[PDB]
Scaffold this active site. Structure first.
Site, short mmCIF file in Angstrom:
data_model
loop_
_atom_site.label_atom_id
_atom_site.label_comp_id
_atom_site.label_asym_id
_atom_site.label_seq_id
_atom_site.Cartn_x
_atom_site.Cartn_y
_atom_site.Cartn_z
N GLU A 37 0.84 -1.20 0.00
CA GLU A 37 0.00 0.00 0.00
C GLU A 37 0.87 1.25 0.00
OE1 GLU A 37 -3.54 0.50 -0.03
OE2 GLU A 37 -3.53 -1.59 -0.73
N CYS A 192 -12.56 2.95 -14.69
CA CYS A 192 -13.14 4.30 -14.48
C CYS A 192 -11.96 5.25 -14.36
CB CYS A 192 -14.03 4.27 -13.26
SG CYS A 192 -14.98 5.76 -12.88
N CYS A 199 -16.93 3.01 -19.74
CA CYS A 199 -18.20 2.63 -19.14
C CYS A 199 -18.79 1.35 -19.72
CB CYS A 199 -19.20 3.80 -19.25
SG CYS A 199 -18.63 5.35 -18.49
N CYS A 208 -25.08 3.84 -12.78
CA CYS A 208 -24.25 5.05 -12.59
C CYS A 208 -24.90 6.33 -13.10
CB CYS A 208 -22.90 4.77 -13.27
SG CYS A 208 -21.75 6.16 -13.26
S1 SF4 Z 1 -20.17 3.51 -15.54
FE1 SF4 Z 1 -19.74 5.11 -13.89
S2 SF4 Z 1 -18.45 4.11 -12.38
FE2 SF4 Z 1 -18.30 2.82 -14.30
S3 SF4 Z 1 -16.56 3.63 -15.55
FE3 SF4 Z 1 -18.35 4.78 -16.25
S4 SF4 Z 1 -18.36 6.68 -14.92
FE4 SF4 Z 1 -17.00 5.12 -13.87
#
Ligand code: SF4
Length: 224
Positions: A37, A192, A199, A208
């Site tokens: 970490e 993301c 997405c 989302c």
């Molecule tokens: S759907 Fe939402 S959480 Fe997933 S990559 Fe796209 S912006 Fe990020």
């Protein structure tokens, strides 16, 4: 999106695509998770792996790290940058040797009391290595939650950071916490992303709020 749906979709995603063979997940221990970490804080994974392997061969236990000269630690860190991390790492090893018999502490207040270790790093060490029920909030995780739940504002403001900790607590499960917390790091790192997130490869895309409105560039908010 409801929290119980969030955690189940992230877990099913991790089952099928997740990173499971990093060196610190083989035969995990609190010592191995803490070292990883700290190296990952300001360095990308491909660079960190050779350094992690050299540190575990030279220092197999936290007492070996404590007893070594600080200069030998700085020499092995060469190339990782941000050397305050290395100076705090050595002092923390000496604290564990001196106060805790050489055994890495297993309670939240004793772990977060180590230099170089804050609230998210402490919960990562105890959830990933022992299955304790603590949420994480590093930069990867902040971006996933702020886009899914449309949390604007700069997280440098306390009220905003506290809203993000409350959301992480809500979606983090007890059953499967080790898998879920690694999966949220992986999503924030590989899917993301800061620019043009992927997405259509994301398991949260059906719920989302940023994806529904093509508004990912608003979350998290930037420094005003
Ligand atoms: S759907 Fe939402 S959480 Fe997933 S990559 Fe796209 S912006 Fe990020």
């Amino acid at each position: 999106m409801q929290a119980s749906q969030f955690s189940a979709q992230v877990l099913d995603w991790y089952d099928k695509y997740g990173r499971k063979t990093l060196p610190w997940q083989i035969d995990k221990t609190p010592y191995k998770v803490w070292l990883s970490e700290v190296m990952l804080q300001q360095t990308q994974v491909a660079t960190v792996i050779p350094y992690f392997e050299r540190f575990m061969a030279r220092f197999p236990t936290v007492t070996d790290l404590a007893n070594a000269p600080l200069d030998e630690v700085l020499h092995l860190w060469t190339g990782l940058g941000y050397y305050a991390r290395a100076r705090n790492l050595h002092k923390a090893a000496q604290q564990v040797a001196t106060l805790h018999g050489g055994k890495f502490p297993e309670t939240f207040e004793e772990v977060a009391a180590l230099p170089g270790v804050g609230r998210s790093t402490a919960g990562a060490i105890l959830s990933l290595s022992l299955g304790k029920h603590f949420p994480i909030l590093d930069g990867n995780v902040k971006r996933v939650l702020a886009r899914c739940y449309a949390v604007s504002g700069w997280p440098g403001k306390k009220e905003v950071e506290n809203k993000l900790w409350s959301l992480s607590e809500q979606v983090t499960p007890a059953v499967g916490v080790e898998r879920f917390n690694q999966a949220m790091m992986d999503l924030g790192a590989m899917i993301c992303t800061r620019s043009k997130p992927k997405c259509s490869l994301c398991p949260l895309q059906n719920g989302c709020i940023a994806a529904a409105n093509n508004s990912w560039a608003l979350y998290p908010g930037k420094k005003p």
